[PDB]
Structure 1
Amino acid sequence: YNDLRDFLTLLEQQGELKRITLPVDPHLEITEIADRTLRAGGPALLFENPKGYSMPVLCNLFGTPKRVAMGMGQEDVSALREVGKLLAFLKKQVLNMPTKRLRGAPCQQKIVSGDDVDLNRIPIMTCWPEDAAPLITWGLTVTRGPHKERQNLGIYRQQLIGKNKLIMRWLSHRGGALDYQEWCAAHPGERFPVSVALGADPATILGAVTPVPDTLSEYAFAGLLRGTKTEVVKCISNDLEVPASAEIVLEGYIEQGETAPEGPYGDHTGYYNEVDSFPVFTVTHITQREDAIYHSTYTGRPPDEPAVLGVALNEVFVPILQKQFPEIVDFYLPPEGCSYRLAVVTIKKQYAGHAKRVMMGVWSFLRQFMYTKFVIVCDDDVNARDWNDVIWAITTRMDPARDTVLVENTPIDYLDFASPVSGLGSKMGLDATNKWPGETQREWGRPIKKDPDVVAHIDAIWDELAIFN
C-alpha cells in the first residue's frame, strides 16, 4: 500500500522529482519556479528549504500526463477510459467498496489543538502578486451530509484569514456545499464538522477530482484506481475519516452564518476574480506526520497543473463520444484554452460536410462540451495534441470564409466576460479537413509521404551516423 512518500521515491528513481535545496520563498517565488518547470514539461518539485519554514513544500506533482498515469499505477492515461465506461452504465454492486479504517495512523503522530493551532507555521503559498492572502490549494475537503452516509471529497480553495480560520470556497453545486446547505436546513445553528487532508496518496487525490456522482464516495473510486480499499483513520474531533498516510490534517467546523470576503485570487482563466462571500472554516485541530511535507499548487494563466490533470481526466469522456461518433479518432481540450473553451477533434471523414455534423455533435451531445466556443475539426493524419500539425492543417486545408462556421446566441458560461451578454454568445467551428468533390472544385493536394524502406534503413544506421555524440 503506497502512500505519498512511496510515490515521491518512485518519481525520484525515474528522474521525475527534483529536490531544491536553495532557499525559496512560498510568497510568489515557488509559483514562478513551478510555472517555468511545468511549461517546459519538467519534473515535480520538492522545496526542502522554504524561506521562513521548516516543512518542505511539494508542488508540480501532476505537471505532466505521465505523472498522472504513474499516480494510478499505470504506464499511460487510458485506464481512465475504463472509468468512463463504468460511470456511463449507471444512468456493479462491489463499487460500494468501502474504506479500510485503521485505529491510529502516521497523520496523527503530532497533534496541536485549540489555541495552539497556528496555520502561519505552515508554508502556505501566495501565488500571484495581487492575491489577497496565502491560499491552500491541494486540500482534500471531507464532508458528510445529514441524509446519507457517503463521504464527499473535493478540492476547494482555502484562503488564510487567521491563526485558525480559513475561508471555504466551494462553488454551490459541489458535494461539500450541498452537504453544508442541507446540514443548515436540518439542524439550525449547529456547527458543521469538516476535515481537510493534505498530501494523501495519489489515488485518493485523483479520485477526489474524478467527477463521480454525488451519491458515491470519492474514496470508493480511489479504491478502483488503486486496486485496494482506501486506508483511512477517524478524525479526532469528529466522525469523518481522512487518509491514514496524509501528511497534514486540519479538523474543525463551520459556524453557521459565519462568512468572509474571499479573494480576489488569480484563477485558471488567467484573470483575478472579484471578491465574494464564502463560509469560514474554523480549525480546532492540526494533526501531522513527523517530518511532514506540505503539498501545494497554483492555478493561473494556463497551462497549470490543474489543467494538465483536467486533460488526463477528459479521457473519461472520449469513449462516450466515440460510442456516439465512431468517426472520432481523438478529442482534445488544450489546457491553454482554459481547459474547456477550445476543442480539437480528429476524424476519419466519410462524406462531404462531415465536419459540420461533428461540430454540432460537440456542441450538443454532452453537457461537458456545450460551452466550448471554438472547435477545430481535422483529419486523422493530424495529431490533435501538437499545434504544429493543427496549424498546418488549418493553414493548408481551409479557406477561412468557406470553412468557418459561426453560430450566434448560444449558451456561454456566465463568467466568461468576453461574450456580449452574460450567459449568451457565439461559437466558431473551423473545418480544417481535406475537402472532397462538392466542397471544392480544385485538385486537392497530395501530402508528402516518406518511403518506409528509407526510414527503416536510416533507423538502422542512426547510432553509427553519430550526429549527436
Structure 2
Amino acid sequence: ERVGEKDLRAALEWFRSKGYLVETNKEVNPDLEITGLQKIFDGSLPMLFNNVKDMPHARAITNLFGDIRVVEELFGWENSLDRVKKVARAIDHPLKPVIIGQDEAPVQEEVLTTDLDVNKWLTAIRHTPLETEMTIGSGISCVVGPYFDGGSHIGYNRMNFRWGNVGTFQISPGSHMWQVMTEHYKDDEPIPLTMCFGVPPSCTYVAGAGFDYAILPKGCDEIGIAGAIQGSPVRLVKCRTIDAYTLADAEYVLEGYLHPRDKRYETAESEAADIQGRFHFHPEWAGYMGKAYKAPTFHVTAITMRRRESKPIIFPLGVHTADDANIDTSVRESAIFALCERLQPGIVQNVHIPYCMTDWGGCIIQVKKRNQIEEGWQRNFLAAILACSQGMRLAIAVSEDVDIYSMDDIMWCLTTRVNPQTDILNPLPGGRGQTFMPAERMTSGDKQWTASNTQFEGGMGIDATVPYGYESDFHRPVYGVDLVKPENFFDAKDIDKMKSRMAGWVLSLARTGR
C-alpha cells in the first residue's frame, strides 16, 4: 500500500524530468522562510525543501502552481483558453471516484489513533513577522457521501491547532462547508470530515474553486471533477476512526469531527481582547494583512500518513502569491465560462481572472457580438456573474480585439470604451459580500467587523465592449509588423538588444502590431 496513482510524488517526478523542479537540502525554517522564499520567486517553478526545521519526517514543496504554464503542461493543456474550455467540459462530465481497500491506500500506512499532536506532525508556518501564531493552511477539507447530498466536496480551510488535537476551522460564509454546517447546525452529532495534505494536483486544482454554486451547487461531485481533470478516477478509502472517506493517495490525513456550535478564537490575542476583525492572523486573498475571528473547532481523532521514512510531502503556500491565485481562479474562470455559455452560448470567447484581481474579487470576460440581436448580452453576463459569485466586486466585459491577459490593455479599454453614465453597472447594492474585503468590512461602522455587520456596496460591472455596428469606428487598426523583417535591416546582435529592452504592454502591442 505504498503507491499513489496520479499522486503528488508522480507530479514531482514529472517536474524533475522536465527540469521544472528546484531542490535544496538546506534546512528551511517554517517561520518566515518558506513564505519569504516563495514571495521572492512569486509565480516561478516549484521548490522542494528536503529538510524542514523541527520536522525531520516532512518534506515541503512550494510554488507548485506558481507558474500557470507548467501547470497547463502537467495537465496537458495548450494554453489558458484551452484549459478553461477543457475544465468547463470536465465540470459537465465528472468521473465517479473509485473506492479501494483500507490495506492498499498509501495514506494509511501509519495510523495514529492516540498521541494526537497535530502540530508535531503537520508543518505549521508563519507568513509575515507581524503574526503571532503558526497556522496550518496546507490541508483541504473532504466531505463525501450523506453530508454533501451524495456528492463530494474538497476545499481549503485554515486551521490553528492551539489545543493539541483541537483547532479552529475557518469557514467562508456561503461556501459549501458553510452550507453543510448550516444544514447541520443544530444536530446532536458532530460533522465527520477529514483534512487531506499533499493531495494529487488535480484535487488541489479543484479545491481551489469556490463561490461558483450556480455551476457547482451543493451535492455536486468535486472529486469527480478532479478525476475528470486528471483523466482518471480519484481513489477514495474508508477512514479508520470515523464514518467517512478520504483521498487514498494523499500524504497526511486528519480524521475528526467538526463542532459547529463549539466556536473559539483563532489567536490568543483576539481571544484575550475578545473582538473579531482585528488582531492580524495572516495575509488573506484580497491582498491585505489578515484578521482573526471566532470559528468552529475540528476535533481530531486520528492522524494517518504514509511511511514516515518516506518523508511525506506537505504543500504550504502563502496566501498572496501567484500559487494561491492560480489555485482558486482557474476553476473560477472555468465556472464563469460555463455559466455564460449556459445563458447564451457562443457569445463569451474567453474568461480570465488575473492575479491582480483578488481571487474572489473580480473577473474579465471577452464577448463577441455576432449580430444586432446579441447586443446587450454582455450586461446580462455581468449581472449574472456579479449575482452568482458572492462578493465579487469588479466584473469587466471587453470585446474580441482586446488582449484579456494584459492589464494595460484592459486599462486602455476602460479609458476609451466606457461611458461612465451608462456602462457602469451596480446590480445588487445591499447583497451579500465578502467580509475579508476591507472596503466592505469598514461598512460595519461601530459594530463587530464580521459578516453579520458588513454592508455590500453592490459590486461594479463595467461594460467596456464596443457597441455592435460601430466596429469600424472603434477599430485598433494595425501596424505593418508582418510586412517587414528586422533581419533585412539589422544584425542579430542589435535585434536582441532592442528586444531585451522591451517589456510590458509593448510585448502585446508588437505581437499583434496593434
Same fold (TM over 0.5): yes
Which of 449, 452, 458 is residue 482 of structure 2 equivalent to?
A: 452
**Structure 1 residue 58 and structure 2 residue 57: aligned?**
no
**Structure 1 residue 261 and structure 2 residue 265: aligned?**
yes
Please name the residue that 1:318 is paired with.
Answer: 337
Q: 1:412 to 1:98 in 2, by over 3 A?
A: same
CA distance in 2, matches of 1:123, 1:365: 37
Deviations 1:25-74 (A, max 9, x none): 21122112112322xx3101112232332222112211122343345454
| Residues 208 and 329, structure 2, Cα contact 8 Å, conserved in 1 | no
Once the two structures are TM-superposed, the CA of residue 10 in structure 1 deviates from its matched residue by: 0.6
CA distance in 2, matches of 1:49, 1:343: 39
Q: 1:347 to 1:199 in 2, by over 3 A?
A: same
Relative to its length, the structure with more strand (as a share) is 1
Q: 1:343 to 1:294 in 2, by over 3 A?
A: closer
Deviations 1:281-302 (A, max 9, x none): 22232222232112212213xx
Q: 1:465 to 1:426 in 2, by over 3 A?
A: same
Q: 1:147 to 1:338 in 2, by over 3 A?
A: closer
CA distance in 2, matches of 1:223, 1:409: 36
Q: 1:161 to 1:353 in 2, by over 3 A?
A: farther
Please name the residue that 2:156 is paired with.
Answer: 155
**Structure 1 residue 338 and structure 2 residue 358: aligned?**
yes
| Residues 254 and 282, structure 1, Cα contact 8 Å, conserved in 2 | yes
Identify the range of structure 1 (339-348 vs 49-58) with the bigger mean alpha-carbon deviation: 339-348
Once the two structures are TM-superposed, the CA of residue 353 in structure 1 deviates from its matched residue by: 13
Please name the residue that 2:411 is paired with.
Answer: 391
Once the two structures are TM-superposed, the CA of residue 450 in structure 1 deviates from its matched residue by: 1.9
Once the two structures are TM-superposed, the CA of residue 362 in structure 1 deviates from its matched residue by: 0.8
| Residues 355 and 433, structure 1, Cα contact 8 Å, conserved in 2 | no
CA distance in 2, matches of 1:164, 1:370: 33
Q: 1:50 to 1:452 in 2, by over 3 A?
A: same
Which of 276, 282, 285 is residue 302 of structure 2 equivalent to?
A: 285
| Residues 222 and 230, structure 1, Cα contact 8 Å, conserved in 2 | yes
SS of corresponding position for 2:72: helix
Identify the range of structure 1 (385-394 vs 144-153) with the bigger mean alpha-carbon deviation: 144-153
Q: 1:343 to 1:201 in 2, by over 3 A?
A: closer
CA distance in 2, matches of 1:21, 1:362: 49
Deviations 1:183-224 (A, max 9, x none): 5644x2x45433211012122333334463322343322222
**Structure 1 residue 84 and structure 2 residue 88: aligned?**
yes
| Residues 111 and 288, structure 1, Cα contact 8 Å, conserved in 2 | yes
**Structure 1 residue 202 and structure 2 residue 176: aligned?**
no
Q: 1:407 to 1:216 in 2, by over 3 A?
A: closer
Please name the residue that 2:439 is paired with.
Answer: 418
SS of corresponding position for 1:9: helix
Deviations 1:236-264 (A, max 9, x none): 21232222221111222345743211254
| Residues 238 and 244, structure 2, Cα contact 8 Å, conserved in 1 | yes
- Count of aligned positions: 455
| Residues 107 and 248, structure 1, Cα contact 8 Å, conserved in 2 | yes
Once the two structures are TM-superposed, the CA of residue 105 in structure 1 deviates from its matched residue by: 2.5
Report the residue type matching 1:281 in the other structure.
F
Q: 1:205 to 1:102 in 2, by over 3 A?
A: farther
RMSD value over aligned CA atoms?
3.9
TM value normalised by structure 2: 0.75
**Structure 1 residue 47 and structure 2 residue 79: aligned?**
no
Once the two structures are TM-superposed, the CA of residue 5 in structure 1 deviates from its matched residue by: 0.3
SS of corresponding position for 2:41: helix
Deviations 1:334-363 (A, max 9, x none): 221112434334344668999875245312
Q: Percent of aligned pairs with the same residue?
A: 20
Which of 228, 232, 238 is residue 228 of structure 1 equivalent to?
A: 232
**Structure 1 residue 167 and structure 2 residue 187: aligned?**
no
| Residues 124 and 134, structure 2, Cα contact 8 Å, conserved in 1 | yes
**Structure 1 residue 105 and structure 2 residue 80: aligned?**
no
Q: 1:101 to 1:152 in 2, by over 3 A?
A: farther
Once the two structures are TM-superposed, the CA of residue 272 in structure 1 deviates from its matched residue by: 3.9
Report the residue type matching 2:324 in the other structure.
P
Report the residue type matching 1:276 in the other structure.
Y
Please name the residue that 1:138 is paired with.
Answer: 138
Once the two structures are TM-superposed, the CA of residue 104 in structure 1 deviates from its matched residue by: 3.3
**Structure 1 residue 362 and structure 2 residue 382: aligned?**
yes
CA distance in 2, matches of 1:446, 1:148: 51
Deviations 1:109-150 (A, max 9, x none): 233332353523432111233335222223122235468554
Q: 1:4 to 1:87 in 2, by over 3 A?
A: closer
SS of corresponding position for 1:316: helix
What are the ranges of 5 or more consecutive residues in structure 1 without an aligned counterpart? none
| Residues 158 and 166, structure 1, Cα contact 8 Å, conserved in 2 | yes
**Structure 1 residue 193 and structure 2 residue 223: aligned?**
no
| Residues 232 and 242, structure 1, Cα contact 8 Å, conserved in 2 | yes
CA distance in 2, matches of 1:97, 1:228: 9
Identify the range of structure 1 (204-213 vs 353-362) with the bigger mean alpha-carbon deviation: 353-362
What are the ranges of 5 or more consecutive residues in structure 2 without an aligned counterpart? 268-279, 445-453, 501-514
Q: 1:437 to 1:234 in 2, by over 3 A?
A: closer
| Residues 96 and 227, structure 2, Cα contact 8 Å, conserved in 1 | no
Deviations 1:391-416 (A, max 9, x none): 34445x35876786364873462524
Report the residue type matching 2:106 in the other structure.
P
TM value normalised by structure 1: 0.81
| Residues 159 and 168, structure 2, Cα contact 8 Å, conserved in 1 | yes
| Residues 386 and 392, structure 2, Cα contact 8 Å, conserved in 1 | no
